[PDB]
Amino acid sequence: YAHHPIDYERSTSKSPNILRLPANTSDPTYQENMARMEGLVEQLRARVRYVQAGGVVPEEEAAKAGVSISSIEADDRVRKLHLSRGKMLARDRIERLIDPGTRFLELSQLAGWDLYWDDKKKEYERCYSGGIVTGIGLVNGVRCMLVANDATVKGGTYYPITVKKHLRAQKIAEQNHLPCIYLVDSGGANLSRQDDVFPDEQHFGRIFYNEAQMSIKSISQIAVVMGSCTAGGAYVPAMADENIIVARNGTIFLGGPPLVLAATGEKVSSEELGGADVHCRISGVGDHYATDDLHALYLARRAVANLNLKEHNEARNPTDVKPVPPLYDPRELGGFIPDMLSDVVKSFDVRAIIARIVDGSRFDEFKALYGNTLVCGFARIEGMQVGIIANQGILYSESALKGAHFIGLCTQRNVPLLFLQNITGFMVGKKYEEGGIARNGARLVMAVSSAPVPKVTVLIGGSYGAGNYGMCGRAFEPRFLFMWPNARISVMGGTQAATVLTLTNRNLKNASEAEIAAFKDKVKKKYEKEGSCYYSTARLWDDGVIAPEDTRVVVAEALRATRLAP
Amino acid sequence: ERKVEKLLVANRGEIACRVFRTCREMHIRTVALFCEAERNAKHVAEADEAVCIGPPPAVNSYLRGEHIISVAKQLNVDAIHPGYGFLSENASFADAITRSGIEFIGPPASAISLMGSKSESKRIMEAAGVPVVPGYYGENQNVSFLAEEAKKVGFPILIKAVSGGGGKGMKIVERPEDFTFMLESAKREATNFFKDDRVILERYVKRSRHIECQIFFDKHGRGVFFFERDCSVQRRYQKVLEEAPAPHLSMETRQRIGEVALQAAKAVGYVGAGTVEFIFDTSTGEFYFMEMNTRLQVEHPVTEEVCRIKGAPLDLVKLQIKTAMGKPLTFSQEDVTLVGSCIEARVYAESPERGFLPESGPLTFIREPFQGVRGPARTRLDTGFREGDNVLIHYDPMLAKVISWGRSREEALRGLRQALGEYKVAGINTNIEFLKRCCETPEFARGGVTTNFISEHESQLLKSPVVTPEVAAMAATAWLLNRCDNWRGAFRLNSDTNATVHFYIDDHPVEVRLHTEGANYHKIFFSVWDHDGSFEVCSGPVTSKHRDQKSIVNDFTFLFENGMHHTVLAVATEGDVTVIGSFGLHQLRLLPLTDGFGDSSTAGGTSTKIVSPMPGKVSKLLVKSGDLVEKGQVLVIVEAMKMEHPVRALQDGRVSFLVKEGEVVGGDHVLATVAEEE
């Protein structure tokens, strides 16, 4: 009918239905939300600074961070003493190591935030980081995993949060075939929590297991020995394609200098006990002997160069690309996010978020009239086709079917998946249970777990209960996890668990007010005591923590990380 | 005197580049000024340093005179030239510049303030003794007073009224000895137009032609008037085309125009360059003062072509800097002699077919006319824009000025014709076609045109060439090829190719069909408006693969069967196809075909809309009943165990509520009927 184009015009124009046009009006509601978000990011963006240069914050105005006041002078004294030795006490080794003008990720940050409670009731162990810093680094045109042991040995070298971080880094590198670089500085072991860190599985032995399984798959790895690595820490220099020992302060020992005493205590110099022995000794241990920190870093870079990965990365990830920005300003991402601590769940939207994040502000909807709860479709993220699952409302059987169908197509055509978690939302109606809802949930989870597609999840907010099993979860092998500040990970019910557990717990009929004070308030305190900031990341649950505004850059880092894969 | 090494400019545009250029010859520094962005503009690429001033609105930019003065003081500027517009006429700014110690370029603040009010200015000229036609004498105290001064103060009778342009009291009563009709006319004018009963009488002129002499003065009491000018042609008080040598003007008169002009400028006191404007009636043969401007005009380079001083080319801006230098002149009024004739025309980025409304858009391709000497004529073009620039809506629409100096008027007018034709711009409609129409058919080559000359010939003008069916053929072909490989590598079986283009010419859709026979991409045909023919087409190099807003600009060749051949540079986009060639310029709008492609739902939506589940308890409805809902806002929010679960209906049309907040409703209830707006 008076309409005869050739699909384009209708396409390739600034007027295709594919795009999205949710324009906000900045009203009170927007302000209430936008403002809060701002109230939810300032310190997130801040604590980072405090742990960075940990314990030395000369401004002394860090009231925006709820961190307790710490003895700045002690940390400054320790840093001065350490830097007088001739080694750089910072993450400086990293940004010296990575090529200028390139990107970085800082995979796990704020690790071990106020984790352990000391004997002093008001004092926690001052683990500003997990004892290491981990991030994806691009060296000499080669993408690599960077792990650096921090010089914080006051509490002890490695904790249940340190070895877990190291093992997570090793698993990520092995999955993605990114070579690792380890910067080694250790105080040995922790002889206090040794039962928690040494024996059992997924412990310090699995590091040695991984450093051999990698070299089986011919994924070369490199370690730099800046200081002592004793107590089983001396095997990494031994198990290494290339290793670096600094001329003066680089030391490797299987038995400590105190250990020779009380067992043939003919004590001699710490150099002769296994440290950097530049005298043409009989031992052929340690590939590189470098006179200075810069010399060692330079030789590490030079060894990284001769791996032939530059051609493969350059072919797989195009270095010269034209950035395509979204149609709407990314600062608006905080506004559509609702507020917090609201008796009844507030309202929420997804279209706006996806239209703000994706390229050209576009989307490819599958069936949206049907199973209106769940959202699935294709997209574009900086030159790469992506699939997104974002959740909105209370799940039905049909939503599970649609999810299974989408995941089937994505696995069929080798399209990566992105997850945006939300509430559990399993209806409890009797008719729904009689309609085989459990079978359809199984249909969804089977497809989720069976998918060989790389998978990344990011918390939008309100991910509580067994609903994440429908979409995705840490136990379903997501190659990366990141989080927004307004996140709560809890039991099958965030608010309802309060009501349900109020009924069935040794309660007399009378004393109703005192009981709800003792029951409902207490369970609310329990189920929102956990949050994005503490229960997560600090314990390497969903290790990555980010800002809602800069999500697309992070996801693009992740996707470039997962295309060197076999 | 005071040395000058730094020059400051206020305004932007053609004047900025002009002031900047001569500056190079005097070997003086330059400074540029620009609004938000506006940094790719040419003038800033011509100066030595440029400073951003602030927000686009003229209140925010180029009007903060105090901020400009403070910035100039920080730069230790020697001189400032305001130019025309913005702070061109503001005595406070000039006084502040004088207090700061910078040599202001132009008249003193006293002259500007005095000429700001028309009443005090005309008072000054009346005291000076210059023939001035006033606007009023007293009031209508007595009806016999009208007969008393009718033959006294002004024999020509201008009855009119105190105000209002109706003027039915005039009756065009040019006959003196009128006493029974003038009073009746005035009394019938007073009816339904009472206003104030005071009536003013003046001289009435049948014809009007505008004259404006130029003048120059140092600060050491010495000056010399430049040659006269004509501004008869103007539409809606906007200058269109002007001539420095007023054709049909006796030499003796020229001389006298000067003596009158110098008297007025001396009386008020004046320094620098300026222009006195007159009003003239051929029938009376006398000139009467109308207004003067204490500011450099835009028409300065025009009068220059008809005046030489000591046999050397004259530069008007040069002297103004030398006047600011404090040096005295070197020539009397005599050293200046006229030589030949010249004409000028202004091009405006407006649409003649429309209500002369300015348009803003990127400049795709700008042809530049030959700005060199040849034959018996000199032709020049001055433009304040170049390729890749974009017109700003805040500024006035002004592209370039074209001037044709010659030894005789004929040569000058003829020269322009060809030049006006040659200059070409693609991207925005212009009035260039209008100006050429103003030059060909109107027999104003004689030289006699009145102030209202444009008004009567409006029927004759506003006319453009008819788009021949052939023009569609080249225009249609370019859009395909300048977009894709249509007709390139095409192939079918036992058949022949076909591809069609729809043009929305005027308010009627136009269809053109193109097809081939044989194995030839070369042999092509056409059928538009039931007219069929054949031609061949050979393209050029392929350019602009990115096909951005500028899209593709390529030359084309078309050999039609009859025998002709053509060359066409086509910058085609989805919105339109522009073809430039010996035919001229024509842009053909492509039939628009867009209408929410997808969301095209005419469903009635009678019932069972935004139904809520069993728990119900609707509340906090934020939509007004009977208001259009095309975007999917939250029509109703129902709560089921803390489940807001907003429905978010996207059905277009107004929504009618049958429920109220706080009312518990049953499962799948008809909360509202979302129906098409009827």
Ligand SMILES: O=CCCCC[C@@H]1SC[C@@H]2NC(=O)N[C@@H]21
């Ligand atoms: O419309 C009313 C039914 C609401 C079901 C909400 C589901 S049931 C299990 C889970 N726990 C909650 O509190 N909400 C979800």
